[PDB]
């Protein structure tokens, strides 16, 4: 997000004047000649976003050796020419989000050994081997058709949400910190042992039926864990956020103070009957609705430790602080 | 917006325009706020492109610094209104595009000073008010995909697209220049307003709420070639007058038509006539060789009438067929009909 002022315009204009930054965004470009950039050796940043480009021609980037940033998001690309980045070894950021790409062949980023930010969200990708790009720092491949996620050695933030991923592979990665995998087809979490630096992990809307606590024993930094909308049935356990909402949970045990640093705990839409929570000053937010509470257990929870409520209780159950519960 | 080829020539011409700071491309730069004095040191700008940003407001005097402005493109931003005086100091403006914002209204004084404004693109906003008739310089106008209920047509617009609104009233001065009028997907129930547009060549009234078409409304048409009125609620048509000799396309499909009456030679110059998806039982044509495509399926044909129709029309002109027929109907050259 930029603020347009005489100062920021002047800087933009300076970069244009020298042809170091070329803005071709939003010009309804549909076709590009092979030699369009034949005499544009000065170009370091090339912006071609929000056009209607169907194809990139052979050798299109053969004469732009200083290229570091290339933005081609919001076009109609479905594949890439041979050796597209062969002559752009300085490339640090590349976006082709919102195209129609189907595969990224494995040789694509072989010469781009400084590529650190790669944006490929909202394509039709069935194959991209990110593990072959060990320079990656931030990556987004969300909203594609990937079934296998290969994670490179030192990526720090990776969003692969909204795919059909059921396999995660790649070398141990102590730097991966934010991992977004919501809306996928994951049924196991053993791969979590390879990512000891994780702070935020979202595994919501997957096909998890159990979450075994020994997959988390190498975690040095984990603060936020989202596992809503899976099919978890029971849980028997630096964490600040824990989302267990919308599962099939019959019980959740925690032994015991390891829930004391929690500020956000979501238990709503499960089948929980009892739940213990010590006097944790402070817990910021707690959801309990749409469960099967025993009234005694529910009461004790309000003495020690709400942001939701029940509307209609079923037979045998009555409202108690806005939540349904059954008497002993 | 028309598409371009990026060639050494077109890139050279672009770079030359950029070099002189006569064309400024700020498209796609995630611009959110703009300071009133943003263009204080850029008085040379004639074409200003700020499409595909996230601009929420324009300062009222932001364009005082660009008095040579002829083209302004602000498509795909987040504007909900224009402030008073926004174009007061831009008299040379000829094209203004602001499609795909959230504009609710254009106030009547917005274009007072822009007396050369010819091309106006406001499609895909939420407009409930824009008085285009105040802007007589308009030549090409697009206000499609809005919430307009009244359409004031300016005096000399040549092409106007107001499709996908909720228009039930058309008004404004007699306009003999209007050639292409797109009004499909609206709420029209009458066509008396057609009398004020004698230059019309192509008119699309499909997906409206027309139950009748009064043939007299077309008596002043000098050059009408294509008339689309599909997907209305038409039940009966009687086209009796002098034919429109220029008319070559007539789309009456997907109505509720029981008949289309006409004098013997009415349709002799049509090339394309679409009657499919109605309730037509009998229909007549003369033996004209001009017809290229005729659609007849999904009706309620009397076999004798249908067979009389094939005897007069050339074999290849029928380009549709029924698949299965209801009880007591059978296929005749691929079309269902019932014997008398
Ligand atoms: C990865 O890319 C996706 C898709 O562009 C991002 O999702 C969009 O995020 C913005 C801002 O949060 C939302 O306004 C959009 O609605 C989202 N788009 C879609 C299609 O859902 C996502 O934010 C990116 N991931 C990261 C970590 O930045
Ligand atoms: C008026 O503007 C609209 C923009 O909505 C144009 O509609 C687009 O037409 C193109 C084909 O030319 C299609 O690719 C898009 O799907 C249409 N857009 C939408 C939102 O449906 C329309 O063509 C313009 N009218 C004229 C006569 O040019
Ligand atoms: Cl980022
Ligand atoms: Cl004004
Ligand atoms: Na890690």
Author numbering:
A (entry chain B): 27 to 263, 270 to 337, 342 to 364
B (entry chain A): 25 to 364
What wording appears in the published article?
The APL1 proteins contain a signal peptide, a leucine-rich repeat (LRR) domain and a cysteine-rich region followed by a C-terminal coiled-coil (CC) domain containing a helix-loop-helix (HLH) motif. LRIM1 and APL1A—C are members of an LRR family, the LRIM family, that includes several dozen genes found within, but not outside, mosquito genomes (family Culicidae) and are believed to play multiple roles within the innate immune system. The APL1 genes are homologous in sequence, polymorphic and under positive selection pressure. Structural analysis of APL1B identified that the protein exists as a homodimer that is mediated by a unique N-terminus which has no homology to other LRIM family members.
